[PDB]
Structure 1
Amino acid sequence: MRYPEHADPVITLTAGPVNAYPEVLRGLGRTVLYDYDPAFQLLYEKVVDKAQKAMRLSNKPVILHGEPVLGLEAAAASLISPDDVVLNLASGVYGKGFGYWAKRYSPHLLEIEVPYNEAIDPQAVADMLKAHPEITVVSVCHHDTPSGTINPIDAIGALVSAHGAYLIVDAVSSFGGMKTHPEDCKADIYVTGPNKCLGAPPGLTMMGVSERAWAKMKANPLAPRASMLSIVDWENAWSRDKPFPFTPSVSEINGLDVALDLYLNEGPEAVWARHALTAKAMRAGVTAMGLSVWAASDSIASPTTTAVRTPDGVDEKALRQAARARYGVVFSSGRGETLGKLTRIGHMGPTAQPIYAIAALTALGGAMNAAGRKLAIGKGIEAALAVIDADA
């Protein structure tokens, strides 16, 4: 049998977009209220409250009404001005990409760059900051998803705080799937969204903003105002007694409401545990069948996405095509400099359950073997299962 390209797949195991929780999809279907209906004004305020609780924030997170690339661009546009010297940390596609937005808003850019299967070394950060007292803003990506790797942002954030600089963190693909919060890494801007680990569709940004960041953005004549790119316009919009700068994405807010309830009710620690276990089982299976995890070391591999290095000679695009056509299972490609180099299996929200690692391993292995590899698929499944069975 073959799955037609025009027909829906059986299991989507991608790293974004991802399958949304069924409850979230039903939440999207709630009656759409007028945004100034008192019932919606209250709901919106309470959604911000839920986000604050989930993010362990001392102040209100800002919800912006576009998917998190908006948050990233708006952060650069608002916080970075030409007086700033920015240190951008790049260990992958998103990290490198952020530097382009930094350069748009200040001509002064320093970077620490590592190959796209590595993590930023905190020692290198400490040394760079010491050598460059002029640095005023530092940007970092927590989980640089197209590589399936994690940066040590809490240690980095403490170094940056000691230096006296502002920290911008991209935690879009880590928040809700592992332990991370704005406070944990002394973030001044912490950008995330519900469209990865939290199991909602793309459309909203959740942004932690420090008091110091608020003061810097509000002072900056170049910060966007009366714009889609404005953070400052949205400062007070959480309040049931305040207007919205422009019309909020009402149905997405209904989805976010549900997604936050699911996360908070399950227990964040429990949610992080099943992401990590699914990922751990995946990696064990990958290695046992004869493939290589992309990450330079297991220690930096993400608990919310496994990137699998394409064996030299295998056509990675054809591989993903074969996994869907043969088994109905959909994986993510790489992106930018990781495109063609690896395949990504998301372990996010509803797919952060260890049984999905078993499904992913079988489709990935079967597709590899169809491309002429000689993987020990059974051995792979048994190693993944041993991880599941060993979990304490």
Structure 2
Amino acid sequence: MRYPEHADPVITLTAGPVNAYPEVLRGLGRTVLYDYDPAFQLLYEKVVDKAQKAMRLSNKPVILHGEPVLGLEAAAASLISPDDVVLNLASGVYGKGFGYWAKRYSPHLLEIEVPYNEAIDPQAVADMLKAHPEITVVSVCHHDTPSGTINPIDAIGALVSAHGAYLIVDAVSSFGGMKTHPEDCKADIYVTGPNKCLGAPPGLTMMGVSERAWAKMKANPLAPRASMLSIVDWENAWSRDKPFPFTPSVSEINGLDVALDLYLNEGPEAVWARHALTAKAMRAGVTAMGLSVWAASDSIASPTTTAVRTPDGVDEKALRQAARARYGVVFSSGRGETLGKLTRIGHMGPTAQPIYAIAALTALGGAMNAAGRKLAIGKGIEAALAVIDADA
């Protein structure tokens, strides 16, 4: 049998976008209220309050009404001005990518770059900051998804704070699926969104903003105002007694309301544990069957995405196509410089359940063996299952 390309697949195991929880999809179907209806104004405020609790924030997070590249570009546009000297940390596609926006807003850019299977070394950061007291803004990506690797953002953020610089963090593919919060890493801007670990639909940005960052952006004549790129316009929009700069994405807010309830009701630590367990089982299976996890070390592998290195000689695009056509299972490609180098399996929200690692392993192994590899698929399943069974 073969799954047609036009027909829906059986299981989507991708690393962004990902399927939303069934309850969230139902929440999307709530009646669309007028945004100035008192019931919507109250809902919006309570959604911001739930995001605040979720992010363990001392102040309100900002919801912006586009998907997280909006938050990222808006942060650069608003926080970085030509007087700033930016240190950009790049260990992957998003880290490197942020430097391009930084350079659009200040000519002064320094970078620490490591190959796209590695993590940024906090000692390298401490040294760079000591050598360059002129540094005023530092940007970092927590989970650089196209590599499935994690940077030590809490240590980095502490170093950056001691230096006296502002920190911009991309936690789009980490928040909700592992222990991380704006104040854990001393973030001045902390960008996340609904459609990775939180299992909500795509199209919103959730942003932690420090009081210090508010003052810098509001002072900056070059910060976007009356613009889709404006963070400053949205400062007070959380309040039931305040207007919306432009019409919010009402249905997405309904979905996010449900997703926040699910997260908080299940308990963040329980949610993080099942992300990590699913990823750990996946990695054990990949290694046991004869494949390699992309990450330079197991310690930096993401608990929300496993990136599997393509064996030299295998056509990675054809591999993913075979996994869908033969088994109905959809994996993520790489992106930019990781495209063709690896395959990604998301473990995010509804797919952060260990049984999906079992499905992923079987489809990935079967596809690989159809490409002429001779993987020990059975051994891989048994190794993944041993991890699940060992979990205390």
Question: Normalized against structure 2, the TM-score is what?
Answer: 1.00
Partner of 1:242: 242
1:45-84 superposed Cα distances (whole Å, 9 cap, x missing partner): 0000000000000000000000000000000000000000
CA distance in 2, matches of 1:353, 1:21: 12
> 1:313 — aligned with what?
313
Deviations 1:99-155 (A, max 9, x none): 000000000000000000000000000000000000000000000000000000000
Residues 299-346 of structure 1, C-alpha deviation per residue, up to 9 Å, x if partnerless?
Answer: 000000000000000000000000000000000000000000000000
Report the Cα distance in structure 2 between the residues aligned to 1:25 and 1:147, rounded to whole angstroms: 29
SS of 1:295's equivalent in the other structure is coil
User: Paired residue for 1:184?
Assistant: 184
Distance (Å, rounded) in 1 between the aligned partners of 2:211 and 2:272: 28
> What is the deviation of 1:241?
0.3
- Aligned counterparts of 1:211 and 1:201: Cα–Cα separation in 2: 29
1:4 counterpart = 2:4: yes
Q: Give distance in 2, aligned partners of 1:17 and 1:136.
A: 33
Alpha-carbon distance, 1:201 to partner = 1.4
TM-score, reference length from structure 1: 1.00
Q: Secondary structure at the match of 1:332?
A: coil
Deviation string 1:229-262 (CA, Å, 9 cap, x unpaired) is: 0000000000000000000000000000000000
1:353 Cα deviation from its structure 2 partner: 0.1
Aligned residue for 1:292, secondary structure, equals: coil
Structure 1: distance between partners of 2:344 and 2:332: 5
Aligned counterparts of 1:371 and 1:12: Cα–Cα separation in 2: 21
SS for the counterpart of 1:84 is coil
Pairs aligned (count): 392
Residue 197 (structure 1) aligned with residue 197 (structure 2):
yes
Matched, 1:291 2:291: yes
1:275 and 1:45 map into 2 onto residues whose CA distance is 29
Instruction: Extract unaligned runs of 5+ from structure 1.
Output: none
Cα separation, 1, equivalents of 2:267 and 2:123: 34
SS of 2:5's equivalent in the other structure is coil
Cα distance in 2 between the residues matched to 1:44 and 1:335? 34
Alpha-carbon distance between aligned partners in 2 of 1:323 and 1:305, rounded to the nearest angstrom: 17
The equivalent of 1:387 in structure 2 is: 387
Give identity over the alignment, percent. Answer: 100
Q: Which residue of 1 aligns with 2:171?
A: 171
Unaligned runs of 5+ in 2: none
**How far off is 1:280 after superposition?**
0.1
Query: For residues 194 and 183 of structure 2, what CA distance do their matches in structure 1 show?
Result: 19
Deviations 1:188-243 (A, max 9, x none): 00000011000011100000000000000000000000000000000000000000
Which residue pairs with 2:278 in the alignment? 278
Question: What secondary structure, in the 3-state scheme, does the structure 1 residue paired with 2:191 have?
Answer: strand
SS in 2 for 1:110: strand
Deviation at 1:263, TM superposition (A): 0.2
Aligned-residue CA RMSD in angstroms?
A: 0.2
Secondary structure class of the residue paired with 1:6: coil
SS, match of residue 158 in structure 1: helix
User: Deviation of residue 287 (structure 1)?
Assistant: 0.1
